[PDB]
Amino acid sequence: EEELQVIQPDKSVSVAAGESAILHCTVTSLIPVGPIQWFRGAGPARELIYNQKEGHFPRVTTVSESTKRENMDFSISISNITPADAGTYYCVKFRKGSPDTEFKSGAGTELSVRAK
């Protein structure tokens, strides 16, 4: 058997201001038990961008039907991009606990935003 991989296939993505950004991420395994979350930046001051909990991220949703058990695609769409959204975005796998712990991070995707 092989280790879980978190795959962000795109090193960078360019989006025109006002458009929606698509950030890709897939996993190779659904165990160990625990969620996938997206952040902008890394380290202690990183910003939570998405998880599967209802009603928290009005700009962000999954591209694929992530309500299915077999889903391995964690790609997200972010609406209404402005220059303020520029940065490196990480797809991160957690394991459950009190509290949950980071298990494995994807490589990151740099979002650049094109002005007017």
Binding site: L30, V33, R69
Partner: protein, 116 residues
């Protein structure tokens, strides 16, 4: 996500020997409880956890009566049960968080005590 059949609140009086706080997942697809994690939270603390992979329940000493019926998890039922002593001194908002493999979700229920 795991999706929930939501309940705004449940109420009890002096007449209740125990209480149940309902939590029902509507798209559960688990084959074994090893695939499942449950956390019930109150004022930001985990007051009950079930780690399926270890078949291990954990409560703090001030919620010593808190439990779920582990056999019902495969049907999507993660309802919390506790005795009236733990209930009457801990009224307020409870969060039920369920994880199955990589899918997660949560829902909130207010536990209300009516004085008669």
């Amino acid at each position: 996500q795991l999706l929930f059949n939501k309940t705004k609140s449940v109420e009890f009086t002096f007449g209740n020997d125990t209480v149940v706080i309902p939590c029902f997942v509507t798209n559960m697809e688990a084959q074994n409880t090893t695939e499942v994690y449950v956390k019930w939270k109150f004022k930001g603390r985990d007051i009950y956890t079930f780690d399926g992979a270890l078949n291990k329940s954990t409560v703090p000493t001030d919620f010593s009566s808190a439990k779920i019926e582990v056999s019902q998890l495969l049907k999507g039922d993660a309802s919390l049960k506790m005795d009236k002593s733990d209930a009457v001194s801990h009224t307020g908002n409870y969060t039920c968080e369920v994880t199955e493999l990589t899918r997660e979700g949560e829902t909130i229920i207010e536990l209300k005590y009516r004085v008669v």
